Amino acid sequence: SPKEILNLTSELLQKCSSPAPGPGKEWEEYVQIRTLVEKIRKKQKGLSVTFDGKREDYFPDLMKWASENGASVEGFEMVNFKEEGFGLRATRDIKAEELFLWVPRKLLMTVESAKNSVLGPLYSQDRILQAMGNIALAFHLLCERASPNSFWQPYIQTLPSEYDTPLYFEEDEVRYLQSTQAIHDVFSQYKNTARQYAYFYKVIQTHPHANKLPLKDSFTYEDYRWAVSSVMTRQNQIPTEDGSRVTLALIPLWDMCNHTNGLITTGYNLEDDRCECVALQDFRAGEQIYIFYGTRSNAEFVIHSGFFFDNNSHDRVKIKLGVSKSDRLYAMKAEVLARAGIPTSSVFALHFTEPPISAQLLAFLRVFCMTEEELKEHLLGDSAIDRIFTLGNSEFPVSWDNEVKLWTFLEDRASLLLKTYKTTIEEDKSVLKNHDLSVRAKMAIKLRLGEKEILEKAVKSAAVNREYYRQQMEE
């Protein structure tokens, strides 16, 4: 039996180590990889270690554990919510800015605790663990989960047994994402995970420093999927004890908070060596305590956490823009962009929330549409440096004609990008309104709809700005 798994993993490693296939074969390759993984998944027993009963049965112990190591356990409780899963509920009125959550370092799971755990020897021998702190944390989590008397066992036994990351999607759920940007990242994720599994399994079956690890007996694809999905759902960057460096960590109590729009209210206290979180807003007793995870896109939320956030104030799409080398004004535009601290060619973001384009993108577009005289005015003269310094400011345009040109180009580009999607916005809305689909299918369709909606809002904003500057020019 182990030899057939070894053959399957060797094939998976070889296929996942091939160069990137061309556009249009990507999906096929993905499906191919899926196939192999499924076979491997079908001959294994799921997670190697499972805990009988339901998750909530373990939440007291966690609290108790945290309580006995210096963490705050007063003022909140673990509660199931329909729209968010398990989370923190205030048992007492909590005022805004009130320090209400703190977790000392001894409770955390870091790369440092991984190096000094049972994984230590293999970590000191394996190159991928040394380079990839997140994979190292995932394997630390795996190894501690299989250790009956681990210090973090009360925390591990409260972790979810599955996630809604694309690694758990059915194939037809992923097919909804075809012709989007996000799907490529999905592909990446899958490929990476697959390759990594095929690598580490081989390592675990051969390296001597892994013989005393609990993974030598059993190490399934579902184990690694769970580990990496737990880490990418819950990893955080924290300073080391002296503060000179950064490391990855899992924060047991605080990572049960759910997300809402707001500001970061979580920081690390080096003197008291503990993570600290103050209330995002006033939470009365019985009200759910939320935090703001970060300024991540809905694509990142779905791919690295497993949920789509409605009314995400920081939602955006990638756009690839550069100055053409066929342009006779390429050198002057390149020099102006360099002086402004902006690359000649790069990836920018289109945001839903006003303004749809950033100061960086606005300055790039203005240089992109400059005439030779305007470029000269921005490259030579006493006023040149001031004009390039106001380049990203909406209040200080280069010329009405430049604005009209740039907004025309942006509108046309966003409309073309819209034309490159398989479905329209109204198709997606109709599907979401009239069809009942899985949670994951709803996430995929809302994601593609959000991409196209950002593009459509860019189209309309560019049209309105083009008309505004045309009208100013007419008077």
Binding site: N192, R234, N236, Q237, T266, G267, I291, G294
Partner: peptide, 16 residues
């Protein structure tokens, strides 16, 4: 100002 703001579930590169 928080000297070390902590992002929940920060994105890292998984391509080894």
């Amino acid at each position: 100002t928080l000297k070390y703001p902590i992002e929940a579930g920060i994105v890292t590169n998984w391509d080894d």
